[PDB]
C-alpha cells in the first residue's frame, strides 16, 4: 500500500527563451490563478513556488494591492515558499553568492512567516560538492535535484564500480567535510506528475506508467509525483484528478501534498541501505554530451561582469564598511541588501549560464552595472570614513596624505597603479579657461620632483612617477552644493606590501630592468620567462629548476553548437596563433615591473558554413551536425600583455582582440607534462579534486569541459602549476600532455535546448579583454598560489584625506593569524546586531590545518551560514573542507 | 511702549517665504544608482530633522512622486515614517510622477505623468497644488489647458521669460518679457493659469547663512533680487539647488534673518501656503504670456533645443513604446473588455511607470552620461515587452469571440485591426501560419522533413477570402517557408512546432477603430515604377529619381513641382548633448555629390520599393583641437576646432516606398555611422511662399515663424521640436513631412527648406563640466523613418493625422472557425473628423468606463465634434478621468482637448 504524494508546482525560470517581462506577465497569470483556486476549491492543498522567494516580489511589483491575499495564502500553507531567493547555477556564481542566496531567501521567508525545509536544485547544471555542508549550516537537512546523477535500477546487484549510480531516488549525500544530507533525486524528472488526467481511460494509461516509473526507484512506500513543469500553468482540476486516481487504485493512497509533509513521511520510513554519493555531482558517469557544462564559456563577458560585482561587494565594499563602523557606528545594511538582490537577479541559472535569448543578456548587463554602482559608492564612502578618522598629523602641510587598503584575507604584495590629486583649482565664479591656464602655469613652473613619504618622513625610492596632467573633477559634499575643479593629477607606480585586512597611510610631496631585449627574457627572483620566436613562452622556475616550454598557445577551433554545449565540427583542426605573424612591443621596463606585448596575426574561418543555418532551423541535435567552418578566412589579431612584478611569483596576462568571426572558440593552453592523473579546481568553498581523464566506461564526448571559480592547478606531489583567471570559468585538462586549457571566447548563434532560438549576440562580436595568470609551485607554495589567484582579483584600494587629528592609527591590521591553507571569503557585519562576521574555509579536502584567525580585542563565537549563533566552541583547527563562520564581539 | 501713547504711521512689511527643496535629477552626470544612494541620504536627513527640529516646517520634494518609490525600494521599512511625514505636511509631494521634457515625450505621456502622480498622491494622502516645471527646456503651449483640466491652477517654471522691473516702461513688442515673477499664462484654447517664474532661479535661497556678517551680505542681495520682480509683498526664496542636501540649520538661518530685518517676516513655508497668500494679494491683472515658451527672445545659443537630436535612437525607442501603449495595447484591451469583462489596469500601470522612468528631462533629452542611456534602453525594452504581451492577448481575446463560421474548414481565419482614430489605408505586410507540424514525441528533423514534403507537393496557390468567399485579387503572395514556432497555452505546457508560413502583402482600407476578418486558403498590371524613366507614379504623385539621387516630385492634383528633394547633408558638430555647433567656416558635404546607385527592391501595381544609395567621403572626426577645448570646458560658442582632414566613405541607403492608394511617400534611411562629431540631415526645399510653419506639438499644431527673432537671436541655427510632423502651407498648397522619433527639424527660411535631423554625433555631455560621452557619438547601424506628402487646403488636416497614425501598423491575429458573440467586421466608433485627432482609447480604473481623448488639430478654427461609440453614452471628464458636470460639446473650440467617459446604454 503506497502513498502517492502529488506536489503541485511550476518550475519558473525567471527569464529564458523570452525576455523577463514576457515570462513576468505569465507569472501574474499563474499567481492570479492560484489565489482564485484557493477560494473556489477548498480541497486544493498547496502549491510549491519553485523554491525561490523572488517570485513573491515579482508578483507584488505588478499587483502591490494583493499583498494581504499573498500573506494569507502563505499563512495558511496554500503557497509554499523558498527557502532560496533564486535558483542559481552553483558553479558560475561565487562561493559567497551561494550563501547570500540563502541569507536573502531566509530573510524573505522570515518576513512572510513561512518556508519550505528543502534546498531546491531541480534543474541545476551540476551540483557543487559542498551542498551537504551548505545545507546543514543553513538549517536544511535535504536537497532535491534533477541533474548530475542517473538512477541505476533499484533492482541491480552491488558491484559498485559506478560511483555516481544510485539504486534509489533517495540518497545519502556526503560532502568533502563529511556532512551528510538527504538527496532527493527527481529520478523521473520534476514533470513526472504533470497534467494528471480527469477521465478514466486516460487516467489509467497515465497512472499505470507513472506508478511503475516511481516504484522503479523509490526506497519507501512514499512516491513523489511532481505536478508541474517549466512555466506550467496551475492544474486547476487537480482535485478531481486525485479523487479519480483514488477511485481507480484502491491499493494506492493519492494525496495532494507538499515537500514538508513528504520529507516528514520519508523520515519515518527511510531504510538504512541508501546509496552514498560523495562530493560533486556533475554527470561523471554519463556520455558527457548533455552536462551543459559549456554554459561556463557562453557569453564570457557576463561571467567577467559577475566576477567584478562579486569581488566589489564581497571583498571591497563589505570589508571596508565593516571596518568603517568603528568610526561611524553604522553599516549600510539596506543599501547592501539592495545591491545583493540586484546582483542575484542575474544569478538564476538561465541568466548567469548565458543560455537565454539576446534581450535577456542585455537586461543582465544593466543589472550588473546597477549593483556595481551601489557597491562602488558604498566602498568609496567607507574608505573615506576611515581615512578622515586617521591621525594624519605626522605628514607635513605641504603634502597630500593617502591611505592604501588591503581588503583581502592574506598579505598583498603588488605594484599599485595610482592617480593622485596633488592640487585642486576650483572654478569659483571664474571662466574655466582662466582656471585651466593657472593649472598649466603651475606645471610649467614646476622644478621639483614628486615623492612618496611615510609618517616618519622617509622617502620610498621604489615609487615611480609616470607623469602629471590636468583633469576636470568634482566633489559632492554631504552638506553643500557640487564643487567642480581642475585637478593636477600625479600618475605613479607604488610597490607595496600590505598585511591581510590592513591599511597604511603615506603622502605625496615635492622634493637593472626586469626585461632583457637582447635575450627577450623577463626575469625576477622567481621566474625566467623566455619569449620564443613564435610568441610562446619558455618559463624556468628558479627555485625548483623545472623548465616549461611552449606555454601560452592560442588555439582557435570551430563551434557549431549552442549556448549550452560546444561542438567542434567533424575533422576540425585548430588554428594556432603562433603559426601566424608575431610582433613584440615593450610597454614598460623597470626594476619593479615589466610589461611586454606579444601580438599574433593569424587567419581563421570568418564563420561556419551555410549548412549550420539549416541544421539550427531544423533543430538538429548538436551531436549529429555536419556543418563545418567556412572556407573564407579573415585575419584575427591577438595582443597579450604580460606583466611581471619584482616580488611577485605570479605572472599576469591580459589578452585582447576584436572578435569579428562567428561560431568559434578561442583558448589559451599551458602544457605542463606533469606526472599526475588528477587536478585541482577552485570550486564552491572547496579545492575539488578531479580526474584528468573522464570515465571511459560511460564518456563519449571527445571533450571534458569543467567549471572553475578563481583557479585550476596541476600538482605532482612536489611541483606544479597554478593558472588563475578573472571570470574565465571554463577549463579543460588535456590528459595526454597534462595541458591546462582556458577558454577565452566561445561564439555561437543560437540558445539551444527545445527549439530554434536565434541569438546573434551570443557570437560575442567586438572587443574583448581576458585576464589570467601563471604561477609555478612547490609543496611549500601550493596553497599560497591558491589564495593569490583568489585575492589577486582584488586591487589595493586607495583614498585621499588631509592633515587632521584622528582616533585611528595611520597603519593598522584589523586581523592577524593568517594561514596559507585557510581562505577568507567574508568580512562583513551581521544584520541583527552589527557584530563583525568572518567566513573562512579549508583550501584542502584531504588535510586538516591550524586555524589561527584573530581579531585584536575581539572574542569569536561560531555561527551557521545564516549568522545564527551555534553551541559549538571556536575550533583551533579546521576539518577537511570545513567552512567556518564566526561572529566577533569586543572583549 | 512709547508708541502706544504717541502712535506713528502703521508700516507695511514684506513676507519672505523660504521653501526648502532639492531639485533631484533622477539620473544625469552619474548613473542612476550613484544619484539614488545620495537620495537615500537626503530623505534620511529629512526624517531625522523632522524628529529633532520642531521649527522645520516642510520640504518640497521637487514635484515628483517617483522619489518616494526610489527611497522605499532601498528602505521599505521606512514606509510608516514616510507616510507620517506626508500626513503631517513635513514632506510636500507631487503632483507629477516625474519631471519631463515636455516636447520630447508624447502628448499622452504628458497626461499620464499627471495621472500616475495623482494616483501616487491619493495613495499617500497629500499633494501640492502646483504644476512643476522648474528646469524644463521649453514649455509646451498647452500647459495652461493641461494644468486646468488636471485640477491645477498654477505652474512654476524657470526658463524663457525675462522679467523687467516695476521701474521701466514695458516693451510691447517683447512677447516673452514680463513685468513680474507672476504672470497670466494663456494657452491656444484660451485657458489661463497663474505662471510662477523662478526669476532668480530655483536656487536663489540656497545655503542661507547662520552668521550675521554673511547673512547681511546674503539677504541685502537676495531681498533686492526678489523685490525687483515680485508683484506682491510675498517674496519667494527657494532654499535648494541641483541635488542639494537639506540645509539642516535653516531654522537658525530664518531666526537670524527675522532679527536682522524688522520690516520682513521670514517664514519657513511651502508652495500651498505661498499660493494661498498670492490669491489674497495678486493684482487683478498681470502681464499675459501667450502659448509656448521656448526662449524665442534670447540669443538662441542656450535654449538647449538640440537635445531633440541627441541620441536619436532613444527618441525612436520612446516613440515605439509610446505608440505600443497608447495606440495598440490600450485600444485593443479597451475593446477586449466587452468580451472578457476585465482590463489589465495593473500591468498597464507597471508598463507606464517603467516607460516614464525614461521621461525625466535629462533622461529623454539624451543629455546624461553613457551609463544612464544604456540603462534607459533596458527600460524601453521592458515597457515594450509588457505592452506587446498585453496587445497580443487583447487581439486574441477579441478574435476568439468573433463568429468565424462563414469561413470554410480548409481555410485559416485572421482578423485585421485598425487601432487608430481615422480610416487606415495601407498595404499590410503579413506572415501567416498556414499549418502546424507539432514535435510530439518524434525527432524534430523528421517533422521538419514532413513539412518540406508538404511544400514540395503543393500545386495550388494561396488566396485571401472574405466572409462571402470572395477572393481579394490585390493580395500578393511573396513566398512560403518553414519556421520553428511555439504556442504557450493558458492551461497546459508549451507547444513547439514547425509552421508553414505564408508571406504576403494585403492592400486594405479599414475604418477608424475597426476590425475585419478574412481567411487564407488554397485555390486555383502596370507597375508603379518605370525603370526606363526612373519614375515612381501613382494617382497622387509623380516621383522622378534624378541622376544625382535627389527627387523631383509632381503633385498630380495641383500640378505643383518640387525639384531637388531628399538631399542628405553632413556637417560638423563640435558641441555637446545640449547644443549643436557647426565649426567656423564649416562647409556641408552632400550625398548627391558622391557615388550614386539605384536598386529596385520590389515593383508591382500595389507597391514599389526603390533604394537610392549614395557613397560620399566625410571627415572621420573633429580635429585634434576639440579634445583640448572639451577638457578645458571652453564654451561651445568660443570653440575653434574644425573637422578632421582625414575622411572615410559613408554609404547611405534610402528605401522609398510608394503605395497605390497612398498620398504619403515613405522613406527609410540606413547607414553604419563610423564617424564622430558630425550631424546628418535630410532636406526638403519647398520654395513655398509663407512666413510661418506648423509643427506637431503637445496636443496642438503650433504655428511658429520661419525666421527667429532678429532683435535677439545670434545662433545661426534655429532648431525646433516636433512630435509626428512639421508642415509648410501657403493657404492653398503645402508640404507635410512626417517622422518616427526624429524630433528635431529646422526651417531654412530663404528657400523654406524643411530639414530633418537624422543623426547628431558628439563626445561630451556639456553643461557644468567635462563629462566625456563616447556613446553619444551614436556609432553603429541606424535606420530612420520619415515621409513626404504634398497637400492642398482639402487634404491638409488628413496629412496631419496620417503622419500621426501612420506610425501605427495594422494589427493582425489568427483564430480558428468558431461560434462567437462578435461580428466578423465591426467599427467600434463612428463620427470621425479630419480636424479632430484621437489620442487615447482606454479604460478607467474606477469603473472600467471607456475613456476617449480627442483634440482640435487647429489653433485657429473651431470644428464639428461628431465622435460616437455605438451602444455607449458619453459624459465629459477632466484629463484625470474624473466626471465633470459639463455637457458633451457638438463642436471643439480652438485647440480644445476633450476627454470623455463612455458607458454602455
Ligand atoms: Zn530551469
Ligand atoms: Zn533639472
Residue numbers in the entry:
A (entry chain B): 3 to 513, 522 to 901
B (entry chain A): -9 to 514, 521 to 901
What does the paper say about this structure?
Comparison of SpGH38 with Drosophila Golgi α−mannosidase II suggests a conserved domain architecture and catalytic centre in which diversification in the “leaving group” subsites accounts for the subtly different specificity.
However, the structural divergence was significant enough to prevent either being used as a suitable molecular replacement model for SpGH38, even when shorter, more conserved, features were used. The SpGH38 dimer forms through an inter-digitation of the β−3 domain into the opening formed between α/β and β−2 domains of an adjacent molecule. A series of van der Waals' and hydrogen bonding interactions stabilize this intra-molecular connection involving hydrophobic residues Y574, V629, W764, Y766, F767 from the α/β and β−2 domains with F429, F433, P434, Y438, F474, Y476, L478, P479, F483, P486, and F488 of the β−3 domain which would be surface exposed in a monomeric state. This insertion of the β−3 domain effectively reduces the area of the putative Man5GlcNAc binding site in an adjacent molecule and introduces Y476, F483, R484, and Q431 which could putatively stabilize GlcNAc and Man substituents thereby anchoring a high mannose substrate. One possible reason for this may be the insertion of the β−1 domain into the active centre of the dimer mate in the crystal forms observed here.
